[PDB]
Structure formats: C-alpha cells, structure tokens
C-alpha cells in the first residue's frame, strides 16, 4: 500500500514518496493562529476551565495522569443556544496552545460520490496522528451527525456512512489516545445516540445564555 515512484518507460521502483493526503484535508490545518485570549470570553468561566483541563492540560502534563492511572477523557461536545460563545472558546483554545489545530467543518465531509466522505474523515485523523499532539475541531456537527433513520422507499444513508466512519475512527478497534476531538453544536436533540456515548465525545458541556453579569462583561 505504500506510494512509490516508478520509471516511466521501464517500470521500476526508485523512491518511496511521503504519504499523500487529500487536498481538502490539508487545507483544514490552521497555520495562522487566531488571536483571542481567554480573557476575551466572558461569563463562560466554569466551562472554559472544564475544557482546558480536558483538551489542553492532558496534553502538557502527561506525567500527572500516568501517575494516577486515569485515561484522559476523549472528546468535548459544546452545545447551547444559537450564539453563546461556542466557537469563541474553540478559536481561543486554538491560540493558547502550541499544537496542530485541524479545523473541520459541518457540511464539508459530505461529498456526492460513494466513499468520498469517508476519505476526508480517515485522512483528517491520519494527518493529525501523523503530526504532534493535535486537536481536531468538528464544528456544526448536525450536518454529519443527524439521527439514524429507518425507512423504505428512498432515504439518506450516504451521509450516514461518513458518521459511521467518524464513530469507529474516534473509538473503535483502535485506542487512539493523542488526537483530541472538540465538537460544536446548537441542536443536541437531533444527534444520533451513538455519537453521544462516553467513549466518543465525553465531556458534554452546556453553554447557557448570560444571566445578569455575563452581559456586563460581555459588553
């Protein structure tokens, strides 16, 4: 399965090229880090900490978890009303961290041809593993995480396979433990029950509207 170059006329292996990734998957790796300090976010203090201690701290203090023998939590789902600060924390957490920040999207893993969606998910996780500690952010998870649906006379399973490949890639037949997954959603009722397990995205944070003081700092 390795990629090897071959002489054009007398076919013969000459070099072993580096593994190739889909051009789409390489364009989702952030190179210009966003500039948004944690002090920019207001009100979400009990939730910003809960994320930094599940996606950033376990990446710099590995000596601490291994001392107590607790596998670090896998995944952080962020849900809440339309606009509360979900993407601000993700963008901010992409600034105070010296690690790859593979930035996925929602509608984007969806592709017309059969199996093209799986490629962009397997390739989006192999690339993160191929690099140093990485955080893979999947924003707008509704488009690829709608609840599975039984039916005859037409339906939609092309998108469902992409989700099924995301499910197994996150936690299935392989205990990958260096790629951290952050997900953003504003409608958790529609998500497939399989995507809200404990092995998959684990720390399901609730982002509430500012009450009476967050609106003061927010301004």
């Amino acid at each position: 399965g390795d990629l090897v170059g071959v002489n054009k006329d007398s076919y013969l292996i000459l070099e072993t090229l580096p593994t190739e990734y889909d051009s789409r998957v390489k364009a989702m790796e952030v190179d210009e880090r966003p500039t948004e300090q944690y002090s920019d976010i207001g009100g979400l203090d009990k939730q910003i900490q809960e994320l930094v201690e599940a996606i950033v701290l376990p990446m710099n203090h590995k000596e601490k978890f291994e001392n107590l023998g607790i596998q670090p939590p896998k995944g952080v789902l962020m849900y809440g009303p339309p606009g509360t600060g979900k993407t601000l924390l993700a963008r901010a957490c992409a600034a105070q961290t010296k690690a790859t920040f593979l930035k996925l999207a929602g509608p984007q893993l969806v592709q017309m041809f059969i199996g093209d969606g799986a490629k962009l998910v397997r390739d989006a996780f192999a690339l993160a593993k191929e690099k140093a500690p990485s955080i893979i952010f999947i924003d707008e998870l509704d488009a690829i995480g709608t609840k599975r649906f039984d039916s005859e006379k037409a339906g939609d399973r092309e998108v469902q396979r992409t989700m099924l490949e995301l499910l197994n890639q996150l936690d299935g037949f392989q205990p990958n433990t260096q790629v951290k997954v952050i997900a953003a959603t504003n409608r958790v009722d529609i998500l497939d029950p399989a995507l809200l397990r404990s092995g998959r995205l684990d720390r399901k944070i609730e982002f509430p509207m500012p009450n009476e003081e967050a609106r003061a700092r927010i301004m």
């Binding site: 203090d45 009990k46 009450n211 009476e212 003081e213």
Partner: protein
Amino acid sequence: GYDLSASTFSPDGRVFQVEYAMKAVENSSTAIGIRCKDGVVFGVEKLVLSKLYEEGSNKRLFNVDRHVGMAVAGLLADARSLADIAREEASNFRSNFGYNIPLKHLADRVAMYVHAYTLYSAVRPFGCSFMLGSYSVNDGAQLYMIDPSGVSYGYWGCAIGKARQAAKTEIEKLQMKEMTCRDIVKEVAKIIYIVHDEVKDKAFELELSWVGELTNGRHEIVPKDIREEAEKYAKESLK
C-alpha cells in the same frame, strides 16, 4: 408536533407537556426540606433580583393549615393557586369530618387535583413543585412532595429546584433519623449555603420554617434569633 397539548401521547408513550412543566420548576431556586424525630424543617433560597424588594417579599413558604407547611419551587402564581387549593381542602376536611386533615390525605388530594390538569387540552399542567410538612403526636413527623405529573411520595429529605441533585447529595450525609429540629435548622442553612452558586446568583436571603413538638404542632416561621445563628453557622462552615 406531538407536544402541543397534554391530551396527546408521544409515539414512545410520554406526555411532553408534563415534561416541559417539570423543566419549568428545574429553573427555579432550590428549596429543601428535612424530616427529623421532632418534626420537619423547610428552607428556601430566595434570590434577591434587586435591592428594591422588601425582605420577605415573594415569600415561597406558605401555611396551608396550622399544622401543615408548604415550600414551593417553580412558577409562583401556580404555587399560590395550589396553596389556596390546599387551604380549601383542609378547611373542608375539618368542617366535614371534624378533625385536622392527615398530611397523607392532603397530599393525595392535592396531587389528584394536579393530575386532573394533565389530561385535557383545555388546561395546562401546573408549573410548580412543592412539599408539605406536618407534625402530630398520633401521626408523627411527615414530609411529602408533589410534582407537576401529580406524583406524591413521602420523603425523609427532599429538594426541588435548580440544585436538587447537589442538595440531595448533601442531605444524604445528615443521618437525620436521630436528630432534633434545632440541629436540622443549622444543617439546612449549611446545605442551602453550599448549594447556592455565587457566580450565577447575585445575592440571596434564607427563609426557614418548621413544625414540630417544639412548636406544639403549629407551623410557624423560625424565630429571627435561630435564623441568625444558623446563618452564622453556615458562614463559618464555608471557611
């Protein structure tokens, strides 16, 4: 759209209007109640939305009868309406049968009244949960809770509102079986102060009531001296 009326079942067999009513009470300040050998004690975390309200305004502790208390959580209008209904039921029972209404009977009657509002599209489920407490020599201490669905159960200790889970966890360490109301008042103050969230809530005032042998079977607000002692104990605890 299967959650527009209380008279329509969900395909999975649920009445969604009752669930929404339950969610309404979950967004209110916590109100706990503890039963002891002597009697029962009730505490309510009263959020002070603004400094313009007179202390004691929007009281959430009611006296449905001289021997039965009432602590409410949820929509205060429905809570007051159900308090009025409980008062009416107790008065009717006294007039007809000639003695104080047993707490279990009153809880069952009020629960059935609440349940009657969870069957028709002409009415909406009550958005309030509440607990009744009473003490009598013949019957002893009792404590019941009624939810929007109309479920009545007897509790040794219960909490209703936002911090129900935390309050229940903290109550579980109280070994309330062999304690008196005096210690329970301080314990209730400490529990209310522990569950309260200062970051979310600006400030709050502690409201307490009790009914037991010490009160000769009469439900009444705790004397201000005991309230101050309990509050000081709560502050000392959070050191």
